Amino acid sequence: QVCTGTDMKLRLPASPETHLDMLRHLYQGCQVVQGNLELTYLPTNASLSFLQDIQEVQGYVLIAHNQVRQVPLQRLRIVRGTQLFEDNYALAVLDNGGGLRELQLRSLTEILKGGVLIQRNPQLCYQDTILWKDIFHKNNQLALTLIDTNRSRACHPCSPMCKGSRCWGESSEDCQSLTRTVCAGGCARCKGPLPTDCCHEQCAAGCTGPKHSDCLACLHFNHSGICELHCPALVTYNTDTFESMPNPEGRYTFGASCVTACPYNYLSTDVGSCTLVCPLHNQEVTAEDGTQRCEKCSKPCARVCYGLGMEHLREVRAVTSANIQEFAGCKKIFGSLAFLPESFDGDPASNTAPLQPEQLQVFETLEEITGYLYISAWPDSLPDLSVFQNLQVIRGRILHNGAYSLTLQGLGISWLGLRSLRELGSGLALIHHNTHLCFVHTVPWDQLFRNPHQALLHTANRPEDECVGEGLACHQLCARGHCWGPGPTQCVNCSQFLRGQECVEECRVLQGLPREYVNARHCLPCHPECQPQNGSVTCFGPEADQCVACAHYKDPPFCVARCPSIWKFPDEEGACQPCPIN
Amino acid sequence: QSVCAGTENKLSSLSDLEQQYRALRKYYENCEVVMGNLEITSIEHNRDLSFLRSVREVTGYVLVALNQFRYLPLENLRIIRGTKLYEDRYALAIFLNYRKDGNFGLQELGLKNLTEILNGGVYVDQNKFLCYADTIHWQDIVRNPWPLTLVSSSGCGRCHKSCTGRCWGPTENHCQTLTRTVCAEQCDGRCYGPYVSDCCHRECAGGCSGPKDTDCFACMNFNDSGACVTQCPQTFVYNPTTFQLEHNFNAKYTYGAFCVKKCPHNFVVDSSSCVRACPSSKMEVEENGIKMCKPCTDICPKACDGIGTGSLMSAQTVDSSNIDKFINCTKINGNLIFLVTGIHGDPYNAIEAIDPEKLNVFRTVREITGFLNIQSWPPNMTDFSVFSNLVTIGGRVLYSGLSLLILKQQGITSLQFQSLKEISAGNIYITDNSNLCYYHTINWTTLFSTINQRIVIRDNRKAENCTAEGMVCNHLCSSDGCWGPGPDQCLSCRRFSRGRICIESCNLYDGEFREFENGSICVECDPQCEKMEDGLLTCHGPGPDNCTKCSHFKDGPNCVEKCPDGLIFKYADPDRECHPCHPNCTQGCNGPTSHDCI
Amino acid sequence: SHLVKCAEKEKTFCVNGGECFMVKDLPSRYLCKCPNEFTGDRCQNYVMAS
Ligand SMILES: *[C@@H]1O[C@H](CO)[C@@H](O[C@@H]2O[C@H](CO)[C@@H](O[C@@H]3O[C@H](CO[C@H]4O[C@H](CO)[C@@H](O)[C@H](O)[C@@H]4O)[C@@H](O)[C@H](O[C@H]4O[C@H](CO)[C@@H](O)[C@H](O)[C@@H]4O)[C@@H]3O)[C@H](O)[C@H]2NC(C)=O)[C@H](O)[C@H]1NC(C)=O
């Protein structure tokens, strides 16, 4: 499997009580980490066995402020360095002090870009035994290296089984394997001193044989086990008949691999690649159920409603009274939403007033968010998030601190609301320190999530015993106690009928109230001119054509309020007949 | 690059052996790149074939059969692409090259440079005096072996003691070089030495001087300005750092195995490539003078298959069995060809001659994207009244250098192509039409798109003979000429015209109908207004807004025969403008005031 | 010369005055000898002098 990375750098965990659960859900059972691998602030005796599967990291690897003695990354082979820590380093080990004893990185043979930074680790032995020039790539020899000799532990001698004394640790299995500095040819990587130990130009991290199917890691694109320079195109040009034609072997490019179809949240583009944003002069189209693609505009494109993190809002901290008006009439926002302190408070340095509850109403039309929704402040007069009650989908293509798509911190909310919400496309949900929030424990969260590596993380909300002690519970007219809040409107799935978004027991066919005809899960009124008799058809249907009895001016084919001005007039029985004069 | 085309004859020849040799010279002399086949048949043993030394590449197959010469001077031939194969199997076929009753025949191949065949097999058979066809490791040359490649002479000797035993001739200067079966295991392509460091680029075919995409003897896939590549540089580059598609500079258009900055004007631009036709899921459009293609919306225009394209890929001519496909067609996507076997039938096959009435289906065709090739026409059809509404031809496919070709038709006396306005690219060739009269009057640079186009006219009916004792262009016709007799066959006229007919004057003030001149093409004005007397103008332009006098009443800016009363009501005078009615009129109206409601 | 005349049932293979011949052995294959005005694999079309 393939999993994503945090991109928090050195900042404190948002919820220190759940930080190990965040890391286990993001990284358990995956081979490839897209983005960065960041392991920071781990407590003494933290259970890290879920990391043992990772072979590839596409960004940098950051290990900082941890109290664990070892981190089980011995299967890691390649760090691509497509992003660097402080713009300089691909591997950084900082302040782990009773601290890290050994690096234990036995399989690491490639760092494609950036340097190695190891500082302030008193207990960490075997930093200066490793030949770091064998790990840096031939074409990217920046080699910026900082090593810290100020060790407090007395180092055990390197095992006599290691020919060059290149230990990563105390064991005979911790010896560095050299793949660049031991070959006489021009070969980027090889498996031994012989000319026959050199391997294929597209292999990275070493080889088990001379062919492009013998690679330990693939330099460019992994085509389902075969290592390749480009993914095969979807369309090929016939050199002799001068026409473009489909390629039966064509693949979509996705990260550093080739696929026949892209993962659920990715937007397919007709050139043969999968993206989080659509190219200029294109629309998103839900061409088939459960998927989406880009299509070209045949005429000049309509206005696109952008949110935080994109275009002219990409450097903006939060939604405020200075910019909230840009969302007027928007049903879909391309970007994220964030409501923080100094969104619902003033800023004398920016000459900007606080948001009012009457200004939040601009989001009443909103149905879809392409990024994340983060709320850490909310007006005390609003018991819920009902201003977002029509929100259906949060895609999660941009996540808060690379991990969270839905985040609620320290709010005065009594129940969530959000009853239209059907999907959380990507990322974790984090809800904590909300001392009045009750109904978070009755939402069917497993129905909102769309793959593995997704979960709800929660702590410090209203105890279930305090909810029951005040009678705060799901309404009886809906499935299995699944509720977004109190009362008949916040039910997920009504068992009988829905009228005005309330669950109800009866469909008003024989009752003293204004009568309604029956539909599959709904009840709708009779035409007022039709007589409210006790028969199930006589008053009942979506047009007067279904009525059998009429209060006044009855036109024989259907009931009407008045005889139409061929002109008609009422007869001696109150029924409409043609006039002698039109 | 000295490009030339193949003969497509197979084993067939001219009956005169000297003319068969002279034709071989005309086709291949001083050529480097052969498109189609290289076919050498029935050549006499004393003929000089040294002109073949310039040939470097062949796109189809190489066929050598039934010859009596000793040696093939093909010392520069490197690669055979095999995009068409002999008998659909063989890219290189050499057979029966000896005289049955003598000592003459092929002795040595001379093919020392031949290093790869991309497609198909090899066929060497019954060459009685040929040495060194055997002892060649043909699996180094063929890119996709089939353990095809049939090889089958004595007294040839060992090549040389210094040679590896694989050789094209009787000395050490003719040894075969192995490039694929003697390589380091890491190589995808071919080698310049036995070491892993002397291996060369994967996109290069038939050998290398060095490891780069610049250092190659021949290219497979595309030549990007001297570098050999899998595809031309695109308008977008994928960024796997961000999962975004980013706009690219230096992006080039793909055109016929080369990368170019500008796509030629004859071709449709589609996704950074130049194409002859756009795929059926899209529609061809024009913007800013550029031909391009975009996704189909609603119901899109469709072109029919031509001869040599689509469902007619196997057709050599329009004939009595395939002509029905053109019945409702307005555009032909391909060539339109009329050969003797199509018009007069083909008794070897089941196909009969065409009834001249059937040819009337082409009267709806306005564009032919390929060339128009006419070599036969029914015995007593004297013109091309079929195609009278044809507007434009050619430029995407040519026959040699030609878009319009008319050879040896004696029954034709005039052309009559009324609607033909432009020929986008290619030349014109009209000869041997000994009864064709009007051809000499045409100013052909008015039909050509560029100064590089030319026309060949010769051996038709003498212009002075037909002018003096025959037919001439209409008195209204300009110096640009006419397609045939009368006022409606002229290319451009003096005075005025209506539809396709040229006229002296346009009935502006005199006639049972009345018009406005409207530049060169005259148009009728709205008939509800009056037709003026005494030589006076009837209309200032089109519509009821431009009439000079009205026979009825009016409304707003124009002459009106009936006003929209009874809608709401509206009052009309018999000889003045119509008036809005007073409110609350229910049965009729006599004017705008309170007593006018009936 | 490695060629024989084709049979009367198949002599219609060549058009425009071309003569029909068959190769002495195998499947079998055929060729036409064209007059100096015609070309193509069975004499289908005209020779052009340009
Ligand atoms: C090109 O391809 C079309 C198919 O797209 C072929 O088919 C049709 O052919 C006819 C005759 O050429 C075309 O023209 C019309 O023919 C009608 C013949 O009657 C039959 O069709 C009508 C259809 O409503 C039936 O009611 C009737 O019972 C017959 O089965 C004429 O009726 C039409 O004109 C007369 O009727 C109309 C009625 O509105 C009047 O307005 C006219 O004044 C007149 O009195 C007309 O002549 C027809 O258009 C084609 N149909 C289609 C589906 O397009 C062609 O044969 C084929 N070949 C070419 C090149 O034409």
Ligand SMILES: *[C@@H]1O[C@H](CO)[C@@H](O[C@@H]2O[C@H](CO)[C@@H](O[C@@H]3O[C@H](CO)[C@@H](O)[C@H](O[C@H]4O[C@H](CO)[C@@H](O)[C@H](O)[C@@H]4O)[C@@H]3O)[C@H](O)[C@H]2NC(C)=O)[C@H](O)[C@H]1NC(C)=O
């Ligand atoms: C057919 O096979 C022949 C070999 O039999 C093969 O070789 C070509 O030979 C000619 C000479 O007959 C080479 O000629 C080049 O001509 C230029 C211009 O005059 C010279 O500058 C070159 O010589 C110098 O520069 C080269 C730079 O790379 C040096 O390598 C060289 O040692 C000289 O210093 C050179 O003589 C011709 O280059 C080669 N061919 C190649 C690809 O090198 C020929 O390729 C075969 N036929 C075809 C059409 O492929």
Ligand SMILES: *[C@@H]1O[C@H](CO)[C@@H](O[C@@H]2O[C@H](CO)[C@@H](O[C@@H]3O[C@H](CO[C@H]4O[C@H](CO)[C@@H](O)[C@H](O)[C@@H]4O)[C@@H](O)[C@H](O)[C@@H]3O)[C@H](O)[C@H]2NC(C)=O)[C@H](O)[C@H]1NC(C)=O
């Ligand atoms: C009555 O006869 C008239 C001639 O006597 C007809 O000609 C004129 O038609 C135009 C509409 O095409 C009327 O309205 C004007 O349209 C022009 C259009 O501008 C573009 O074209 C001109 C060249 O024609 C070019 O110079 C410009 O750069 C533009 O590319 C507008 O510029 C005007 O504002 C206006 O809308 C004319 O009014 C009309 N001529 C006269 C004398 O009225 C006319 O169409 C005939 N029919 C009708 C219904 O009036």
Ligand SMILES: *[C@@H]1O[C@H](CO)[C@@H](O[C@@H]2O[C@H](CO)[C@@H](O[C@@H]3O[C@H](CO)[C@@H](O)[C@H](O)[C@@H]3O)[C@H](O)[C@H]2NC(C)=O)[C@H](O)[C@H]1NC(C)=O
């Ligand atoms: C290129 O990508 C392919 C996947 O498309 C990678 O193949 C994967 O190889 C790993 C081992 O490296 C397999 O995991 C192992 O599977 C066995 C199954 O019995 C299990 O016993 C092991 O404990 C381990 O989980 C994995 O299944 C396999 N995936 C597939 C779909 O075949 C390949 O490694 C990549 N190549 C490079 C050079 O990166």
Ligand SMILES: *[C@@H]1O[C@H](CO)[C@@H](O[C@@H]2O[C@H](CO)[C@@H](O[C@@H]3O[C@H](CO)[C@@H](O)[C@H](O)[C@@H]3O)[C@H](O)[C@H]2NC(C)=O)[C@H](O)[C@H]1NC(C)=O
């Ligand atoms: C929850 O929502 C579902 C729709 O997603 C509601 O619809 C469906 O309701 C029926 C009846 O309760 C469930 O059972 C099946 O009903 C048919 C009726 O003809 C019967 O033939 C079958 O034998 C079976 O009893 C059905 O499973 C259910 N849909 C799904 C997908 O589960 C459902 O009523 C809602 N539940 C509540 C309590 O609101």
Ligand SMILES: *[C@@H]1O[C@H](CO)[C@@H](O[C@@H]2O[C@H](CO)[C@@H](O[C@@H]3O[C@H](CO)[C@@H](O)[C@H](O)[C@@H]3O)[C@H](O)[C@H]2NC(C)=O)[C@H](O)[C@H]1NC(C)=O
């Ligand atoms: C890739 O394409 C380039 C052109 O863009 C090819 O280079 C061209 O090769 C032709 C070969 O005929 C050269 O033309 C020849 O020039 C010599 C000049 O002495 C002349 O004697 C010949 O008769 C012929 O006209 C042409 O100059 C040359 N162009 C450039 C810019 O160098 C190249 O060969 C292609 N590569 C492959 C592997 O296909």
Ligand SMILES: *[C@@H]1O[C@H](CO)[C@@H](O[C@@H]2O[C@H](CO)[C@@H](O[C@@H]3O[C@H](CO)[C@@H](O)[C@H](O)[C@@H]3O)[C@H](O)[C@H]2NC(C)=O)[C@H](O)[C@H]1NC(C)=O
């Ligand atoms: C055949 O048709 C071509 C156009 O396709 C005619 O060429 C045109 O020649 C005229 C002059 O006859 C050019 O107009 C002007 O001529 C004067 C000199 O008389 C000169 O001072 C102006 O600068 C201007 O050139 C016209 O531009 C030119 N058109 C083109 C496209 O070159 C040709 O005259 C026609 N021949 C006959 C006899 O029909």
Ligand SMILES: *[C@@H]1O[C@H](CO)[C@@H](O[C@@H]2O[C@H](CO)[C@@H](O[C@@H]3O[C@H](CO)[C@@H](O)[C@H](O)[C@@H]3O)[C@H](O)[C@H]2NC(C)=O)[C@H](O)[C@H]1NC(C)=O
């Ligand atoms: C009276 O003659 C005038 C010219 O003196 C005619 O006006 C011109 O009409 C043509 C169409 O017949 C217009 O050209 C075409 O316009 C379309 C617009 O989409 C374009 O796609 C074509 O490429 C082409 O340019 C032309 O623009 C127009 N000229 C002006 C100055 O407006 C007029 O149609 C004649 N009226 C009658 C009743 O025939």
Ligand SMILES: *[C@@H]1O[C@H](CO)[C@@H](O[C@@H]2O[C@H](CO)[C@@H](O)[C@H](O)[C@H]2NC(C)=O)[C@H](O)[C@H]1NC(C)=O
């Ligand atoms: C390891 O500790 C030594 C001191 O034992 C550090 O070296 C000192 O660095 C300061 C920097 O301002 C100099 O002024 C001193 O003169 C240095 N002392 C000696 C003894 O050289 C060194 O920086 C420490 N290294 C790390 C990576 O923390």
Ligand SMILES: *[C@@H]1O[C@H](CO)[C@@H](O[C@@H]2O[C@H](CO)[C@@H](O)[C@H](O)[C@H]2NC(C)=O)[C@H](O)[C@H]1NC(C)=O
């Ligand atoms: C529909 O049923 C209601 C009763 O549910 C009928 O109203 C009753 O009419 C009788 C007539 O004698 C009265 O005595 C009752 O007091 C009424 N009951 C109520 C609840 O008002 C009504 O007439 C029925 N309508 C039809 C079409 O039969």
Ligand SMILES: *[C@@H]1O[C@H](CO)[C@@H](O)[C@H](O)[C@H]1NC(C)=O
């Ligand atoms: C770690 O576990 C050891 C026992 O294995 C125990 O002595 C120690 O106190 C633990 N440390 C913490 C901080 O839990």
Ligand SMILES: *[C@@H]1O[C@H](CO)[C@@H](O)[C@H](O)[C@H]1NC(C)=O
């Ligand atoms: C002209 O051609 C028609 C085709 O139907 C044929 O019937 C007629 O006999 C021919 N007449 C002459 C004089 O060629």
Ligand SMILES: *[C@@H]1O[C@H](CO)[C@@H](O)[C@H](O)[C@H]1NC(C)=O
């Ligand atoms: C003119 O051509 C006609 C064609 O029939 C011919 O009879 C006549 O002799 C020709 N005249 C001259 C002067 O060539």
